[PDB]
Design a protein around this nucleic acid. Sequence first.
DNA 1: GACTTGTGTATAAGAGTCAG
DNA 2: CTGACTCTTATACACAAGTC
DNA 3: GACTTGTGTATAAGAGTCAG
DNA 4: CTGACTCTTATACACAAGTC
Lengths: 458, 458
Amino acid sequence: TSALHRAADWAKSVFSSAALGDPRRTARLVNVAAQLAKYSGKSITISSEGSKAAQEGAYRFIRNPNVSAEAIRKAGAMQTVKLAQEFPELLAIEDTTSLSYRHQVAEELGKLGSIQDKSRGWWVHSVLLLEATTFRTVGLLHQEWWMRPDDPADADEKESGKWLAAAATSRLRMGSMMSNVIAVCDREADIHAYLQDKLAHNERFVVRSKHPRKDVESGLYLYDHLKNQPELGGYQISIPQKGVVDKRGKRKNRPARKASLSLRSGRITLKQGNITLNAVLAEEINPPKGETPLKWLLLTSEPVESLAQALRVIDIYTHRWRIEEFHKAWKTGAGAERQRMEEPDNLERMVSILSFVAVRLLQLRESFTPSQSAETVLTPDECQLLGYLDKGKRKRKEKAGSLQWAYMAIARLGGFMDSKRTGIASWGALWEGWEALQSKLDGFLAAKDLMAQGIKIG
Amino acid sequence: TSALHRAADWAKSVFSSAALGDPRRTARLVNVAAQLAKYSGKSITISSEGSKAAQEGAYRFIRNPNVSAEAIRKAGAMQTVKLAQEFPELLAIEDTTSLSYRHQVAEELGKLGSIQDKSRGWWVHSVLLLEATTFRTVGLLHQEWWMRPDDPADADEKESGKWLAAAATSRLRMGSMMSNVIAVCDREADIHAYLQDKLAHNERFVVRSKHPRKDVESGLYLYDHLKNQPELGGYQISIPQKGVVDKRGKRKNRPARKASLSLRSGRITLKQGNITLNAVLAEEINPPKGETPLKWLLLTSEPVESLAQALRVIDIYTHRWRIEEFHKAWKTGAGAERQRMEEPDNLERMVSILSFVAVRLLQLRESFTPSQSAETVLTPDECQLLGYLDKGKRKRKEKAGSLQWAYMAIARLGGFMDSKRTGIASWGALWEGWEALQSKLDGFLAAKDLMAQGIKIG
DNA sequence: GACTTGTGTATAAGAGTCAG
DNA sequence: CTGACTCTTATACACAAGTC
DNA sequence: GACTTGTGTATAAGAGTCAG
DNA sequence: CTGACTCTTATACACAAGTC
């Protein structure tokens, strides 16, 4: 938030809490995180700016047997917890991804596909906290890493307990801030035991419905009972073009279209556990000749009885993609799967660090997104150089010297050409832009310095 | 050479000759090559520096049906031919690589593996010219692109004729400069018809021996006849550590070692075609308990009768890897296989351009490699900024302000940490460094400009 | 000349990718 | 998932700059 | 204290990758 | 191919800064 742009400051805030059992490890962590963040996406070596000291330090740290990766992730998360004190409502977006490897260490790791696959590694189940008003990323609350065994009957616990394990960690970490938190999960979380545990702790959630369950008071499947309700009202959406590549490698187009949805809600009770909760059902009115009609059924602790309360629910769900965006920031962006440590713990400690770097990529774009001047975000020196680099390229929409102009200017330095006329640049473009602006800033300052000590330039 | 660092200048020299049948196409080619070179490795869009004009231009050019990719490659090659006038002896390193794709266009392309593979594309057979004294890259003389058919009996010509086809093109292109040229090829070129054609044109070559052929005057296999000769003398080599990954995915180490070789030569005559030529044989004296003894048998037009003449031959061959280095510069570096044009000709015209970009990556490092001052290569402004950026990092080996220091300084800006204490940075590190130095130079100049118009910085 | 192609602008959307 | 994007191929105009 | 771990330097080499 | 590299994991010293 306040400590973001300056990588060293950022790393102190995230990591100085870490109980690694020696302040030298925590300071080292801080330094390491700092160089990696300044060089998001690149090798440790490249992050060391030619310092043999820092290179050696970084590598010694991530193979350090007194350094607990669990503790690294926990220390970051407590920072999230500290940050989250700022907000009256939060979303806790929850999902699993895989971290996949094929080098020699992969065989010491866990199953991701078939027993024979060379690609092995970890499953990580993550909780990403956003603030609920403007949806900005607060950070990681929780990650469970595990190695799936080759033999399913060697599992200590069933993988589906990951949703409850996460709840247990969030509540513990958030403490009394938990009633502030709304857990968002997809169909994998449509587990009776999971809904039950939330309600029992009086915790808050929006989980999408997969299994047809019956409502006690009507004796009907949730869907049939919800279709009985009066039309709470409607909403139309725009579905954006994209290409599509199926599981067998087959490519098709998905042309943009506009769909319109009828919304309904109701209070519902489930046979199992005699647990009561609410549910919203959005369904498409008159879909075109040959397309899957849209259909969302959402299970929620949240109020649903007014049209607006129900839209709050839909839109809380519409932000679920954000956890995938983190996964992409972790992998493609920060380089989790590009690492090549030769031992599991080494690979873990590194990739642990990289998860908070990932979050910061997200937050960097978010730091520029939202009315007034560029000076609120950039330094005076940053502000002038950007103005020079951008000369001519500024569009008429953009108020001169505004934070909106600063967003675009950086995006353009990152390569952004708005190919879909949406105005929105990827976090990847913003990062390249920021990094470019920062790199050109070295030269700018170097001239300033020399010019300040009375030396002629060129 | 002279026109290299400045991308626009470089592109004019390489491409202003192009007969595309409209000077507008040639100028467009020049512009396109220029932006791509300035942004080696990145997308067309990113290369357009926010110019909608240049983006649209670039894309219109590479889907232009009046633009012949053949002609693009030819125009570059004639520049090579023009450059090569400078040199009294050249190496023409010759080999094939594949350009491989899996997007929708791939199925309109040719076979690279089995009939069923999704990975399809072209085979390209290339001739890379170096000068023979200090081995610097002069450029591409020739490329043959073709699509291997699914059915081997649908081939217009056998693929092994590629060595002769290349000879035919080089001689035509080099004209009377051909007697300056020494063709270097590996075992695939150990074809009787190919040796014969060289000798008949009185062209010059070093080709490694695969098939046991017999010498007429002795009646012995080349190898047995060469082992009869007196020990012309010896030479020892250092073999550098590397990892090894076999075809089935199996990983092993190859530890560094020192090998010593005994050298022999002789004049030889082959039964077929009663063609006479020379041959050198290098073979390892007493290899360690369990390792493949080294063994090179080279067929050559070149003189071989003195120890030194024979070493000239070995070392001419020892530079064969350079064609692989080009292939890597073309693919990984310039991004040939990262392109995603949706039509073969579009994909070809683009990748054609990218092959000369590749060559320039090689030449950029080479432009810094070899006694005196940095000022011989960099501009005064470039020279100062680099000196600032490098403050503290300079080693004692490095004479202050020398071209040797400039090499290291750039390498360090590119991430180079000399992990194998060899002093040699990859072309990839030099490029990142150069690009970084260039990027920081924008800021430096921007401060200069503003400082020159009397505006306060920061 | 008679007719054809490239540029710079502006509008639109198909194809591809990651991760799923 | 109603993902979110960038890469790539289009199309129209007026008008400039080509071939023939 | 008695004993154990991190830093900055310097030396070395195994493991991995591309393209083959 | 005797490829050429970068990434990663080592090891010793003296000495500083930790745990117990």
